[PDB]
Design a protein around this ligand. Structure first.
Ligand code: HEM
Ligand code: HEM
Ligand SMILES: COc1ccnc(CCc2nc3cccnc3[nH]2)c1
Ligand SMILES: COc1ccnc(CCc2nc3cccnc3[nH]2)c1
Ligand SMILES: C[C@H](O)[C@H](O)[C@H]1CNc2nc(N)[nH]c(=O)c2N1
Ligand SMILES: C[C@H](O)[C@H](O)[C@H]1CNc2nc(N)[nH]c(=O)c2N1
Lengths: 414, 414
């Protein structure tokens, strides 16, 4: 009938009718969460006719990985998997395979810019977990492991695989550590205007809103299949950076900071026909993420305005390019602040040179590298980056990390 | 077998094998000149079975345009077109329809950011032209019309439609006005490193290389179907801007300038099953095009280096973000210089706010608006722009402006 289109800034929506009158040459791409990139809910198990092939595939890819194969272990493992499936109607990955699977899936992420690290990954095997308190506990160890007092370390903690689908493990937060946003009496909006909806949810589930500009939202875990249980993150576990500029000292007066730990908590890991609906993973920030996206967007903190004011810049003439000047300085701050407070970080420029290196090793390696230009090209200083002038194909391989329908929209409350 | 991928910066190339192992979810998008966006050569005419439908379509769209239709003129015109086709095996558009066609095609350009102007367009009917000298003459009037002493005006001059295909009108230059690039003895490269190839071609066709950093390349027109004939542009016809910064006065010392007129000369206009392989069109510059792309790219002038030097900035620490600071100032120059020397121009920020307005009027209007996010989002200060957070569908409608195989690659020299 028509296609919905959102504008994450103004949150406005439009319905596209025109495409219908398209030609015999409707590309999506420009879409945030497309269905071609999602792996939603389930009711029943995973039809063996499907599971079995994919299961085999993965296993072949796995043993077809190591130098000088283990032909026998390859066959042996093959057999065992087959046998196990036709006995329980599914199968468990060895830890070494899961590890392979986690790194591959990452390596195969069209939208990750630091994939050149793909081999360095910490795998926490949480597949035995069983309760919310156990989740909450593992999330903590991970956070603590990854934060590593500022010297960040990429990790991942793989909870229980999806069985029937009515017994799914799901972290309800978009990310491990993320400030909350309330809508002040006076109509304003403190904190992260982005998490308005989820913050409410947190309240609705009993969270005590410390109404502030930087409140680190509570973990909202659901295990096995039960309702989600609210948990607060141990204030000690969350390492933050206080924003200060190496020049404009009025900058810290701004009262700005941000968490050092970027961990995606609502993605789904698919491998060998299996899928884990909960498996938080973390890397480390790329400057422009905090400086550009989080601080400047109109749907977040939106600080661009006064940061230019305090620079003298004419905040009434777009043509004056103050915004360009402001943002620039904001980013120099973040890079400074992090740098100073010894919290690992990457400026968008070096990031790109390294991805390019990566991309190249990736083609010589397996003749290819899935990339989503749109996402990969830094939000500012684009054509000043190598990747901007680099054509790239975007495709879904496997293993892979799929988005997935927001849990509240698909739950069974009792 | 495999897909070639170019990196316009380093001009390097890679062959993608991986996509083959893709999944049942290969998107191109990130491609400059895809074949889905091109309309190449021909040998024979355009099969009537095809022409006739499209011809009708267009005509219906055309009369279905004006408020309170001219039902009779609609039918009458319909008839006449039909009659004309089955008598000559093709048909001529009225000027009013061509005009409609030129504005629509523009309006339908997924990659143009100023489409909000789509209704303001000057149409020069050059369909009677017959010789290279006549082309050269019309190109001149257009240039002069459009340049309008700095107060720029968007125009288009539609040469002869493709007949058989062995009688095509083709301007061999990528654009109406564009500096030439030579590769100096000392291995260096003066001028626009981008036009190396075409500059040579110009020599090879008898052009006298005034070996310089800003030499405006000669028109290379081919008419009816003959070989291309070289023509020099009347130095008086090319209005340029000398780059000077409203602060750093060492800036003009840089010896920088750029032409005020952006006109695309090698695109093909397709409308009602007809196609014109030559029809230059011009609008006016969007700052960041000159400041970011043309001056900074490594495949163009590549000035980023010393522009930071002269700012004190540490040109040895990427992390220092000097580049970000440099570019910013370069753009402030261009905007200044143009502004000062009364040459119309648009800063990327206002550009975006206006396109957004446009896009919106465009959906309420005909429920839709084809856009190529990748191209539309300014090369710098992306997420600082509305369009960055605006999902958009990219599709090919008609009329439309298609790229087309580079003429030299497909010619018949005698
Ligand atoms: C070397 C440390 C890393 C850096 C600097 C890094 C950086 C980035 C950046 C800049 C983005 C795009 C920004 C955005 O998501 O809004 C991104 C996306 C992504 N990264 Fe990473 N990454 C790192 C490690 C990882 C690891 C270890 C994984 C998986 C175990 C991963 C998985 C992803 C995925 C799945 C996305 C796309 C998320 C989405 O769709 O929103 N990244 N990364
Ligand atoms: C209101 C004045 C105009 C402005 C500011 C403008 C601006 C732009 C910009 C910024 C781009 C992308 C940059 C690039 O091509 O590398 C673009 C692309 C384009 N514009 Fe315009 N434009 C204007 C008028 C026009 C007109 C009048 C036409 C057709 C009669 C047109 C046709 C196109 C096409 C076909 C493209 C894509 C070119 C390509 O594929 O390389 N534009 N325009
Ligand atoms: C997994 O490694 C990394 C490293 C750097 N960045 C990320 C992005 C995750 C993320 N998604 C988000 C959506 C909204 C607000 N913040 C967000 N962070 C992930
Ligand atoms: C038609 O109106 C406009 C307005 C502003 N910009 C353009 C781009 C055309 C163009 N394509 C190019 C390719 C290489 C070098 N310069 C180029 N200019 C076109
Ligand atoms: C590889 C990539 O497609 C290429 O660098 C594109 C990106 N976006 C662009 N956008 C505009 N407006 N103009 C360009 O020339 C490009 N180049
Ligand atoms: C509409 C558009 O898809 C959206 O704004 C995208 C563009 N590119 C992005 N790129 C990254 N890295 N992160 C994002 O959140 C986005 N947002």
């Amino acid at each position: 009938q028509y296609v919905r289109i959102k504008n994450w800034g103004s949150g406005e929506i439009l319905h596209d009718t025109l495409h219908h009158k398209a030609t015999s040459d409707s590309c999506l791409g420009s879409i945030m969460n497309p269905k071609s990139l999602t792996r939603g809910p389930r009711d029943k198990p995973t039809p063996l006719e499907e599971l079995l092939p994919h299961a085999i595939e993965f296993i072949n890819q796995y043993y077809g990985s190591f130098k000088e194969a283990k032909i026998e272990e390859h066959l042996a493992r093959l057999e065992a998997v087959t046998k196990e499936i036709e006995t329980t109607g599914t199968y468990q990955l060895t830890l070494d395979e899961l590890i392979f699977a986690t790194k591959m899936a990452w390596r195969n992420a069209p939208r990750c810019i630091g994939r050149i690290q793909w081999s360095n990954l910490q795998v926490f095997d949480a597949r035995n977990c069983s309760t919310a308190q156990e989740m909450f506990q593992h999330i903590c160890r991970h956070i603590l492991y990854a934060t590593n007092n500022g010297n960040i370390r990429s990790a991942i903690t793989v909870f229980p695989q999806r069985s029937d689908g009515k017994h799914d493990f799901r972290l309800w937060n978009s990310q491990l550590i993320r400030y909350a946003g309330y809508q002040m009496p006076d109509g304003t909006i403190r904190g992260d205007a982005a998490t308005l909806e989820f913050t409410q949810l947190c309240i609705d589930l009993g969270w005590k809103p410390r109404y502030g500009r930087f409140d680190v939202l509570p973990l909202v875990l659901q295990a096995d299949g039960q309702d989600p249980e609210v948990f607060e993150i141990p204030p000690d576990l969350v390492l933050e950076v206080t924003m200060e500029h190496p020049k404009y000292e009025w900058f810290q007066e701004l009262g700005l900071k941000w968490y050092a730990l970027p961990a995606v908590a609502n993605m789904l890991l698919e491998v060998g026909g299996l899928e884990f609906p909960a498996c938080p993973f973390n890397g480390w920030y790329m400057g422009t993420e905090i400086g550009v996206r989080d601080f400047c967007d109109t749907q977040r903190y939106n600080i661009l305005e006064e940061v230019g004011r305090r620079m003298g810049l004419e905040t009434h003439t777009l043509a004056s390019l103050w915004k360009d000047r402001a943002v620039t300085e904001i980013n120099v701050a973040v890079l400074h602040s992090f740098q100073k407070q010894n919290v690992t970080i990457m400026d968008h420029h070096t990031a790109s040179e390294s991805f390019m290196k990566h991309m190249q090793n990736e083609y010589r390696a397996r003749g290819g590298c899935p990339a989503d230009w749109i996402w990969l090209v830094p939000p500012v200083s684009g054509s000043i980056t190598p990747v901007f002038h680099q054509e790239m194909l975007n495709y879904v391989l496997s293993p892979f990390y799929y988005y997935q329908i927001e849990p509240w929209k698909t739950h069974i409350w009792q």
